C-alpha cells in the first residue's frame, strides 16, 4: 500500500513497498589444524611402511 524511497536514474528505478508494519579462528589456528591432519597422515603411512617392513 505505502510506496517509499523511490530513486530514479536513466538506467531504471528502485523503491520499497510496505504492505504492513512489524510487531573466526586466527592464522595460527588454521595452520595448526592443517598441520595436525598431516601428522595423522604421516603416522598412517609410517604404520603402513612398518607393516610392509615386517
Amino acid at each position: 500500500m505505502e510506496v517509499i524511497e523511490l530513486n530514479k536514474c536513466t538506467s531504471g528505478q528502485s523503491f520499497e513497498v510496505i504492505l504492513k508494519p512489524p510487531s573466526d579462528p586466527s592464522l595460527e589456528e588454521i595452520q595448526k589444524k592443517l598441520e595436525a591432519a598431516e601428522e595423522r597422515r604421516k603416522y598412517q603411512e609410517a604404520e603402513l611402511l612398518k607393516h610392509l617392513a615386517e
Binding site: 510506496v3 524511497e5 531504471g12 528502485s14 513497498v17 508494519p21 592443517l34
Partner: protein, 437 residues
C-alpha cells in the same frame, strides 16, 4: 565505486564462472578480446562496470576474477576457449590431481599445497583495487575441490580480509546430474566450515534447474551448458545492481542488510521468470503481473520447496526490461490477497523493488528466448530449510554405517568432524524451526 572480486572454485564454479563472464561481456558490450568501444574513458575510471572489470592502457577490460581447480581439465578450456584473451594466465590456477570427490582431500591434503599460491594471486587483484568491498565465491557442494578447498579459502579470507563481505553461489547436489555418491557428506562438511565465513549465500539446486530446462526449454536431457546458461541469467540478475546505475543492493553490505536479518539464516531463495524456449515458434509475451505471480510458483524456484509452509524475513524483486513501479504495485496487491505470504512478526511485510530498463541479454544461439520483461525474486524464507532436511537425512543414512568415512579419515580428518558438522546442521535446522513455526 568499490570493487568486487569473483572466485571460481572446482569444476562447477569454473563452468558457471565462464557462463557468467560470457554474459557480463554481452551485457556491457565488452568484446571477447576485452575491448569496450562504448567506454570513452580509456584505461581506467570509476564507472559501475568497473566493480567487475579493471582496464589496461590498451583498453582491455579484464575481469576481477580468479579461477582455481585442483586438476587442469576444465580451466584449460578457459585457457584456449573463445574468451581466452579476457583473462591473464595468473588468474587461472590449476593443479595436476583433483580431490577425488573427497572433502578432506580438497581441504587438508591438496588444500594445504595450493592455498598460499591462490591467496597470493587473490592479493594481486586486491592490490589493483582502490576500495575492495569483498568477494563472490562460486563452487559446488558435491565436489572435493568445490567443497573442501572453498571452505579452507573462506576461512583464510576472514583472516586476510576481515573488513570485507563474502557472498556465495553454491550448487546443491542432485541425483539427476550427480558426480559422487558422497556428495551429501561433502555438502554438510563444507556448509559447517563455511557458515561463520559467509555473509549471504545463494543456493541453486541442480534438480530445480534440470527440471526447469526440461519443462520450459523442452530439453530432453539437459547438459551442464544448458544448466549454466540458465544459472548465469539468475546470477546476472542478482549482480546487476553492482554493475549498473541504481539505488538498491549497490554494495555487498546491502545484500546482508536487505536479505539477512539473522546471520546464520543467510540462504535466500531465488525464483526466476520467465524461462522461454528460443525454439518456440509463437510466443505471447508475459506481463508484469504474470511474471511477478510466477515468482510464487514452486516450479520456478532455484530450490524446490513450499514457501506457504514457512515464513518470510525479507523480499527483493529485481526486474529487467519494460517495467514501471505502478504495474509492480498493482501486481503485488493482487498476489497478496490470493497467496499465502506470511512474514515473521519482527519484520515488516514489504518488498524492496529494483528495476533496470535493459531487458535480459541472451547468449546468441542459446536456449533462452529474448523477453520484454523478466524478474528475479530474492526471498529469505524458512521454507529453504526443506533442502537442509533432505540433505541431512541422506547424510544420516550413510553415516549410520560409517560408510565411506575411511576415505576422509585417510586424508587425515578426524571422524569427530563428521558429527560436529552434522550437529551444526541440526542446530541450523532448529534455528529455521524457531523462526518458521
Amino acid at each position: 565505486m568499490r570493487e568486487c572480486i569473483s572466485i571460481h572454485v572446482g569444476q562447477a564454479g569454473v563452468q558457471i564462472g565462464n557462463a557468467c563472464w560470457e554474459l557480463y561481456c554481452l551485457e556491457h558490450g565488452i568484446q571477447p578480446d576485452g575491448q569496450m568501444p562504448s567506454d570513452k574513458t580509456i584505461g581506467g575510471g570509476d564507472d559501475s562496470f568497473n566493480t567487475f572489470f579493471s582496464e589496461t592502457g590498451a583498453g582491455k577490460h579484464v575481469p576481477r576474477a580468479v579461477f582455481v581447480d585442483l586438476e587442469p581439465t576444465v580451466i584449460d578450456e578457459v585457457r584456449t576457449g573463445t574468451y581466452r584473451q579476457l583473462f591473464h594466465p595468473e588468474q587461472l590456477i590449476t593443479g595436476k590431481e583433483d580431490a577425488a570427490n573427497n572433502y578432506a582431500r580438497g581441504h587438508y591434503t591438496i588444500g594445504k599445497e595450493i592455498i598460499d599460491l591462490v591467496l597470493d594471486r587473490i592479493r594481486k587483484l586486491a592490490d589493483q583495487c582502490t576500495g575492495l568491498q569483498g568477494f563472490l565465491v562460486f563452487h559446488s557442494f558435491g565436489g572435493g575441490t568445490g567443497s573442501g578447498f572453498t571452505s579452507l579459502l573462506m576461512e583464510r579470507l576472514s583472516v586476510d580480509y576481515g573488513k570485507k563481505s563474502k557472498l556465495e553461489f553454491s550448487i546443491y547436489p542432485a541425483p539427476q546430474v550427480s558426480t559422487a555418491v558422497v556428495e551429501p557428506y561433502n555438502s554438510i562438511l563444507t556448509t559447517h566450515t563455511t557458515l561463520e565465513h559467509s555473509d549471504c549465500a545463494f543456493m541453486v539446486d541442480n534438480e530445480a534447474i534440470y527440471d526447469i530446462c526440461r519443462r520450459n526449454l523442452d530439453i530432453e536431457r539437459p547438459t551442464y551448458t544448458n544448466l549454466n546458461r540458465l544459472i548465469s541469467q539468475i546470477v546476472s540478475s542478482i549482480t546487476a545492481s553492482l554493475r549498473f546505475d541504481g539505488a538498491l543492493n549497490v554494495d555487498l553490505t546491502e545484500f546482508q542488510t536487505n536479505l539477512v536479518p539473522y546471520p546464520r539464516i543467510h540462504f535466500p531463495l531465488a525464483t526466476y521468470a520467465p524461462v522461454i524456449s528460443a525454439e518456440k515458434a509463437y510466443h505471447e509475451q508475459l506481463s508484469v503481473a504474470e511474471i511477478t505471480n510466477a515468482c510464487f510458483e514452486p516450479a520456478n524456484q532455484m530450490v524446490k520447496c513450499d514457501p506457504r509452509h514457512g515464513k518470510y524475513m525479507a523480499c527483493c524483486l529485481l526486474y529487467r526490461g519494460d517495467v514501471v513501479p505502478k504495474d509492480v504495485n498493482a501486481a503485488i496487491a493482487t498476489i497478496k490477497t490470493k497467496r499465502s505470504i506470511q512474514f515473521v512478526d519482527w519484520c515488516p511485510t514489504g518488498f524492496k523493488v529494483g528495476i533496470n530498463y535493459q531487458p535480459p541479454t541472451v547468449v546468441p544461439g542459446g536456449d533462452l528466448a529474448k523477453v520484454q520483461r523478466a524478474v528475479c525474486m530474492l526471498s529469505n524464507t524458512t521454507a529453504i530449510a526443506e533442502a537442509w532436511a533432505r540433505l541431512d537425512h541422506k547424510f544420516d543414512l550413510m553415516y549410520a554405517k560409517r560408510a565411506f568415512v575411511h576415505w576422509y579419515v585417510g586424508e587425515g580428518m578426524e571422524e569427530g568432524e563428521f558429527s560436529e558438522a552434522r550437529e551444526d546442521m541440526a542446530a541450523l535446522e532448529k534455528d529455521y524451526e524457531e523462526v518458521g513455526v
